[PDB]
Design a protein around this ligand. Structure first.
Ligand SMILES: [Mg+2]
Ligand SMILES: [Mg+2]
Ligand SMILES: [Mg+2]
Ligand SMILES: [Mg+2]
Ligand SMILES: [Mg+2]
Ligand SMILES: [Mg+2]
Ligand SMILES: [Mg+2]
Ligand SMILES: [Mg+2]
Ligand SMILES: [Mg+2]
Ligand SMILES: [Mg+2]
Ligand SMILES: [Mg+2]
Ligand SMILES: [Mg+2]
Ligand SMILES: [Mg+2]
Ligand SMILES: [Mg+2]
Ligand SMILES: [Mg+2]
Ligand SMILES: [Mg+2]
Ligand SMILES: [Mg+2]
Ligand SMILES: [Mg+2]
Ligand SMILES: [Mg+2]
Ligand SMILES: [Mg+2]
Ligand SMILES: [Mg+2]
Ligand SMILES: [Mg+2]
Ligand SMILES: [Mg+2]
Ligand SMILES: [Mg+2]
Ligand SMILES: [Mg+2]
Ligand SMILES: [Mg+2]
Ligand SMILES: [Mg+2]
Ligand SMILES: [Mg+2]
Ligand SMILES: [Mg+2]
Ligand SMILES: [Mg+2]
Ligand SMILES: [Mg+2]
Ligand SMILES: [Mg+2]
Ligand SMILES: [Mg+2]
Ligand SMILES: [Mg+2]
Ligand SMILES: [Mg+2]
Ligand SMILES: [Mg+2]
Ligand SMILES: [Mg+2]
Ligand SMILES: [Mg+2]
Ligand SMILES: [Zn+2]
Lengths: 159, 105, 61, 213
RNA sequence: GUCUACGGCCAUACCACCCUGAACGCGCCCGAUCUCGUCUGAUCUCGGAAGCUAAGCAGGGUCGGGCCUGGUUAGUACUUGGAUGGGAGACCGCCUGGGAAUACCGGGUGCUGUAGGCUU
RNA sequence: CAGGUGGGGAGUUUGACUGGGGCGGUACACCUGUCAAACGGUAACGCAGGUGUCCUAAGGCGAGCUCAGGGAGGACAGAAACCUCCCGUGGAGCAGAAGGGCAAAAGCUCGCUUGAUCUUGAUUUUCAGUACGAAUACAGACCGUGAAAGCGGGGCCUCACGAUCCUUCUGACCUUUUGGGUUUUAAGCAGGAGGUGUCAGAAAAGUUACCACAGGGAUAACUGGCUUGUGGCGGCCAAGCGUUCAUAGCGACGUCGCUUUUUGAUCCUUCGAUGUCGGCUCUUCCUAUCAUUGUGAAGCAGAAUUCACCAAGCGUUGGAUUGUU
RNA sequence: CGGCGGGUGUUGACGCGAUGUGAUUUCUGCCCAGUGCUCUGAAUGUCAAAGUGAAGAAAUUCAAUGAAGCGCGGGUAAACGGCGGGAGUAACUAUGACUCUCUUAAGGUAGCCAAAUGCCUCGUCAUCUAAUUAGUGACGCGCAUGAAGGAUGAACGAGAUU
RNA sequence: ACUAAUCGAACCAUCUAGUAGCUGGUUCCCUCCGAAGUUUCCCUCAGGAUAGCUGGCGCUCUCGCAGACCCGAGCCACGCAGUUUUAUCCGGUAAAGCGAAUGAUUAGAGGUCUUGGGGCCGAAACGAUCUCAACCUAUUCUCAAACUUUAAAUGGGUAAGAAGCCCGGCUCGCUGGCGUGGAGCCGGGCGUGGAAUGCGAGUGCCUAGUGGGCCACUUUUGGUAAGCAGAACUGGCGCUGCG
RNA sequence: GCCCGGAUAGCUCAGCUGUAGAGCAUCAGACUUUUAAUCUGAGGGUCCAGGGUUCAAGUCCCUGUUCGGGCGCCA
RNA sequence: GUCUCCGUAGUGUAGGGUAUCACGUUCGCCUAACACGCGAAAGGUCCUCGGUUCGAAACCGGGCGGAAACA
């Protein structure tokens, strides 16, 4: 019984944030998108041209094509029991760079620097990051103070 | 809707934008020697009654209006069919509208 | 007379019985759908890429 | 021609206010929510008694009107017509519906059963929570037993369980009676109307100098 | 320490009132022959340089409003998973993890890029 | 041979969904908000609504302005006529339903225009990742506007629509038209249109109690079962009635129950059949007791009566009318 | 099926053929707008084939002419059928003898009735009974009576009722 | 009505083994694998087609196979995941709010204007100023599936390397102030194989049955409710015995 | 779809490219001693709208609006 | 039980910009007196409550009373 309209249920999805209406800031247009970089599809509603469909809002994809005003993005879409890679043309107002890739690139650059330093000197270093290990043994000083005795409080009917 | 009797638009034969005279396309009469009409007449001859469906279930109230364009260049009388959306009332070259006017009593 | 209209019950189990496989990623993604002007210039660059082979080999040497 | 309240006792539906989608709503039975000397100042009536619900349920507007009338009559009898101020802290904003069925011997004569079952508005109820105040009475400190008895009588007009509480707040304000008088003395509270205005130590100094003068 | 031109983020920048502004500048200001626009040289366009910081603008101030950021609210509300837990129910408690928002109370009140000026 | 008449006769059809079917409605093709449980998807004859249009501008550029409302003034003039100032984050307008979006905008007023044009592919939406429809980003022409950057291939976005076959029109000094040639004609190739609203698209009126068949407890009419709105019978509070006095006897406003002796709701059993109203006859059971036994209370003097308790042992009738209960 | 074939017909309007109503008595009202039926064409609208004229090289196209029928116009209700409203109006109110109108054409006449026809309804009144949703008699704005069928009336009935 | 016990169209033979989306039946054993009642379209709703779920047949690869007996002699598989972790985005539900917008809504208080009623003696300048209204201001009670500043828990996407990183060089008709930008290509060097856990993966063909479901916790819509009707999530029954 | 017809004071009907009329309605006068009846006068044209042939048009020609006839019917 | 319609001088009544007619009543004209006729006056807080706008009998919402149609 649900309509198949392209923008059904997007009432808050494409609405602007509070006190952030009006002119689109120009750094969004000044961003540079190459082929192969990773972008988050947001989908603001001030620009009605080149809008992504609501199923791609909040998704992340890789740029494969660059045009005058838009980019082509290869974004995964799960359709029932299969995930298929869809190519979508999105104007640059509705996308932004993804920092998930950038954090990994920083880690790679630091890893290569550390490996070069280790090979230069001769000291081995742990390169793989590890899950949070169990806390080691330590001493807790009382500083000449008895720890404060805590007790549950009596019940009272506030209102 | 109201469309003007002339418009400047692309001419396929001229290969460029040219002035065009605009009329309304009207369906021509049936040939009686078109192959489908011949087949229908042969099928209907004899006994058996009606042999093809007769629609009689109309639902649309309008038609898509087709404009017959004609290039006005004397060496190029090339014609074209432009279809516009469905309209109940269509006028060719009617009087244009004005904004700052009163409603007549 | 009347029947059940729609459900997605058991559909998730059906989808996961053979696994929800991601698309098969591989090197050299296809060039279809890319800007025709950029694509025809890439074809020209590939065609004329042969010339300068001597310069490239000398620099490599 | 009203159904028993056992049919609409529980908050089963989402809130259904009277709005531009719900038209044709009969007016609620209760139209008056404040009684007694509403014009009494904040210092006249320092004692506040509350009726608190232990049930997450719906109270009908008719039940609210009946409880209000009962408590008002008892308070008038035991404390005079100007010895108290009563406030019903619940408003019947939730509309309940009825799927009207033809109550005669006949079914083919357009009874239709459950087809098109959505009902017409019937009445309004007040959706109440556990620990929510239903009714409040403020009065002098010597009328505490009368307030308790009035709320005890009013408890019999309601479906669920209710507690009678004596609030530690001063009257109908949100400030404790322990600190209220000294706050008023140090001008942290200004008595206006039946309540008080809290005066923070921020804003223009002109509003501070109209005080202390 | 500031300003001008173009800006980035787009209130910590906004709003109300008051005070101060040296030098450049920015402006107010003078005029309508030409350019150009008007019901109106008010606006716009043009040609200027007598006067002025009165205004704009800049800086500051206000137990200022707002905004921004903390505390409290509060491990509260809500919530993932669990039980042959309680209760006639309504609902509630516990285990296992996560965890807010007002009111109220503090602090702050634009940062900065490019290019070019002024300030002994 | 042609036209008319022609249920005298022939053949056939007489949609679907559906808290049974019919009547009603369209939940049958679509669009907005909600449902919907903070990705997306999600149902009911769920809720509030809308659609089968309108627009040569309400399309495309560019420029200039600021809207609703309010305050204070100004001859007639008043709550509303116009003029002026000030405030005014949009509280207006953008064709329509709603939602989103929008301020030297996307609104209003002008100037010029026809990108609402000619083309090939790719993609998104429903999706089976088919089609239509709608849409997005390009590319190649030819243009419009603007000083220009640019913007524009319809409407700010979400809807406003349609296969095969057939017909009609337009285009290529195009192909074929059958032994060859010319010319009509006809066929074709490409793109518009004439439509299927049951909207992936048959050409379609009833009746049957004279009826038939294949089936269906997937589905109604009678029992039973769940429920108890409605019906019936109780309880709690006690404003009041009771000359006085809440509670001898009653009980408004509220509120809690029980029963399945009413009627509904549902459709679980039964459609290779459970004989369907009432009466007659006959037995048994229940108690929420009309009478009788023993009792308590009274606004119980007696008599009569009323309320309540243990209590179903025993009884509860003869007739007129009506098929009747 | 067919033959100038056959039935009525060995017949001829006091006859054949087709209908409705249903003895006697007494009446059989208004409506020809609708649908039928029928009648005259009065110029006359539409209208096939054939035929005629023109264009064309021909296929073909166009035009003119206009049979029946329909349409137009008369008649027809013992043809099918139909017989509602509204406004004003009499000296108590109330009704409307009277005057106009609307949908079409006419507005239910004489009669009859809670009838085998009336829902409401077990209508109201009288009678019949101790008691009658029954019967009879009467009334009649009659959901939804009614005139080739209405209203009667002896005799008759394995007809229905008291 | 009757027409040979047959009549709302007799009887006999034939077409004829008429058609049936509907009912009934459908014949030996063991072993292995093992469902669906959902999507889209259909004069479709007791049926099909289609995708999904199933089976069979494979094929392409990965790990090594170890020692005649005995006896390893930083570094340890292609790749995958209904899982967590580390980063990074997405959201508008629960809650909360209304002295924040839009709607709804209770009560006082303080004010000065008005087409408020009017108002005790004021036409006279209500000489006066008492009251009720409306309005404004600061407060106040109660709210929202189709309201919202704020805003969870659970959840959705991406990344966590050799297809990576870094150096040079060549091509371009695209772009262009420029040795410009971008893309492609060619060489070279980097291995501590750059979270945890587990598991061998990839790929093709043919394909049956199903397309009536039902139940439970929790979320949830209509309904007074229902062993009612309709959805979401997971599990189950159906297909399953056992305590 | 083709061939035809009509469209007006409040209501109805006739009408000449050279100046729209008649009746019924309204109002006011006339006749009568008076009321009716009767005679007159005044106002009233959704001339169905638009463009044109037109010096002139309600008229004639085309385009729509409904009201209607007779035909005709393969998406 | 629901749907539709209506709640206005005593009565029936029509009806955003301060309520019309007739009867009922009274009075005044006219007559020698009467009847009639003519004219004037009185008489409806518009069912009740709430709401929007300058202002509501009219428009909107709720609730009462009455009459047809369903049920
Ligand atoms: Mg667009
Ligand atoms: Mg099904
Ligand atoms: Mg519910
Ligand atoms: Mg501040
Ligand atoms: Mg917890
Ligand atoms: Mg027949
Ligand atoms: Mg979700
Ligand atoms: Mg969602
Ligand atoms: Mg502009
Ligand atoms: Mg282009
Ligand atoms: Mg279909
Ligand atoms: Mg069943
Ligand atoms: Mg009951
Ligand atoms: Mg008493
Ligand atoms: Mg069922
Ligand atoms: Mg039997
Ligand atoms: Mg049986
Ligand atoms: Mg038996
Ligand atoms: Mg008993
Ligand atoms: Mg006879
Ligand atoms: Mg003729
Ligand atoms: Mg006659
Ligand atoms: Mg009669
Ligand atoms: Mg009768
Ligand atoms: Mg009878
Ligand atoms: Mg008898
Ligand atoms: Mg009788
Ligand atoms: Mg007759
Ligand atoms: Mg057979
Ligand atoms: Mg079909
Ligand atoms: Mg079956
Ligand atoms: Mg939502
Ligand atoms: Mg909430
Ligand atoms: Mg609010
Ligand atoms: Mg269910
Ligand atoms: Mg089964
Ligand atoms: Mg299984
Ligand atoms: Mg089992
Ligand atoms: Zn041309």
């Amino acid at each position: 019984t649900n309509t198949k309209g392209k923008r059904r249920g997007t009432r808050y999805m494409f609405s602007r944030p509070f006190r952030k209406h009006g002119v689109v800031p120009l750094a969004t247009y000044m961003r540079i998108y190459k082929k192969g970089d990773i972008v988050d599809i947001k989908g603001m509603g001030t620009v009605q041209k080149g809008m992504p469909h609501k199923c791609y809002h909040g998704k992340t994809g890789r740029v494969y094509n660059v045009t005058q005003h838009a980019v082509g993005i290869v974004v995964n879409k799960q359709v029932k029991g299969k995930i298929l890679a869809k190519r979508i043309n999105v104007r640059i107002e509705h996308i932004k760079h993804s920092k998930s890739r950038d954090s990994f690139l920083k880690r790679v650059k630091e890893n290569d620097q550390k490996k070069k330093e280790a090979k230069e000197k001769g000291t081995w270093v742990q390169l793989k990051r590890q899950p949070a290990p169990p806390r080691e043994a330590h001493f807790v000083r009382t500083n000449g103070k008895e720890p404060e005795l805590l007790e549950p409080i009596p019940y009272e009917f506030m209102a | 809707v109201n469309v003007p009797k002339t418009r400047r638009t692309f001419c396929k034969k001229c290969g460029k934008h040219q002035p065009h005279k605009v009329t309304q396309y009207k369906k021509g009469k049936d040939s009686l020697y078109a192959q489908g009409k011949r087949r229908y007449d042969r099928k209907q001859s004899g006994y058996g009654g009606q042999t093809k469906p007769i629609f009689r279930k109309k639902a649309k109230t309008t038609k898509k209006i087709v404009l017959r364009l004609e290039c006005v260049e004397p060496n190029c009388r090339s014609k074209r069919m432009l279809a516009i959306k469905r309209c109940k009332h269509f006028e060719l070259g009617g009087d244009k509208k004005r904004k700052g006017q009163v409603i007549q009593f | 007379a009347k029947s059940k209209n729609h459900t997605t019950h058991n559909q998730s189990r059906k989808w996961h019985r053979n696994g929800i496989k991601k698309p098969r990623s591989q090197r050299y993604e296809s060039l279809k759908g890319v800007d025709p002007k950029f694509l025809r210039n890439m074809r020209f660059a590939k065609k004329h890429n042969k010339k300068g082979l001597k310069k490239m080999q000398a620099n490599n040497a | 021609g009203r159904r028993p309240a056992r049919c609409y006792r529980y908050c089963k539906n989402k809130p259904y206010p009277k709005s531009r989608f719900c038209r044709g709503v009969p007016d609620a039975k209760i139209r008056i929510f404040d009684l007694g000397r509403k014009k009494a100042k904040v210092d006249e009536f320092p004692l506040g008694g509350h009726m608190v619900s232990d049930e997450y349920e719906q109270l009908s507007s008719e039940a609210l009107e009946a409880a209000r009338i009962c408590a008002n009559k008892y308070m008038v009898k035991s404390c005079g017509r100007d010895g108290f101020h009563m406030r019903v802290r619940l408003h019947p904003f939730h509309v309940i519906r009825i799927n009207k069925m033809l109550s005669c011997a006949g079914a083919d004569r357009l009874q239709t059963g459950m087809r098109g079952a959505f009902g017409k508005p019937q009445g309004t109820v007040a959706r109440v929570h556990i620990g929510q105040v239903i009714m409040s009475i403020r009065t002098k400190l010597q009328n505490e037993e009368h307030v308790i008895e009035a709320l005890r009588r009013a408890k019999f007009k309601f479906p669920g369980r209710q507690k009678i509480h004596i609030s530690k707040k001063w009257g109908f304000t949100k400030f404790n009676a322990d600190e209220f008088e000294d706050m008023v003395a140090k001008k942290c509270l200004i008595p206006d109307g039946c309540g008080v205005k809290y005066v923070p130590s921020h804003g223009p100094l002109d509003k501070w100098r109209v005080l202390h003068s």
